[PDB]
């Protein structure tokens, strides 16, 4: 599970890429409830975010990044785009 | 059950405006539990968005759409500010 | 306690911030929930708009603001960073 860059620097991102990764390619210095296992993933992350089911149109934000997600797979974000805030 | 474009192509929405309309206008390829009977205006897909009763100044956000609750009617949104994220 | 500007406007802010201070700082028309007496602080309207515990990282929304989690003191905000949205 994947990460790619787009012509403007923003971010395609799967959904099931998980939290070490994510942070490396976002530059994240942490994520929400770090080390609780709560989630391990960016959809999760996403889901915690928001308190709820995902649904695509959703934006939700955090350090430096406005997240959406683009596509669902059933009871999981499927694709994410990653903005940067600024 | 109005909408009416400012200069800068901001949009000023009444929130008993349906969501049939509010697609058309704002060009969202969605809304969120579309089908599922929750909610007609747009004051309820913000009540919906925030998971509680909406405040004047409350900000949610929905695919390339920023809404800002502009004034209220008692419990229910009276208007609305669209903004266009990038 | 206090609000430092920094040179492209934005502004650090106390999470321990009072209220009339906070309107007055950012000219605001309100604040959530006002006069019921919910939280008295910058802190504790973040955690109100949040639902939950704030972490640094976090971001919300209020009237022309964007509201960053800079720091944390355990169950309070220590520091926020406020930037003007248009």
Request: hydrophobic share 40%; aromatic share 6%; net charge negative.
């Given at each position: 599970?994947?990460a790619?860059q ?81």
């Amino acid at each position: 599970s994947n990460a790619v860059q787009r012509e403007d620097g923003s971010w395609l991102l799967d959904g099931l890429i998980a939290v070490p990764e994510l942070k490396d390619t976002l530059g994240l210095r942490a994520v929400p409830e770090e080390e609780k296992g709560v989630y391990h993933t960016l959809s999760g992350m996403i889901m915690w975010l928001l308190g709820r089911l995902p649904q695509t149109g959703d934006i939700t934000f955090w350090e430096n990044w406005r997240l959406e997600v683009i596509d669902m797979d059933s009871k999981r974000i499927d694709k994410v785009l990653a903005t940067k805030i600024d």
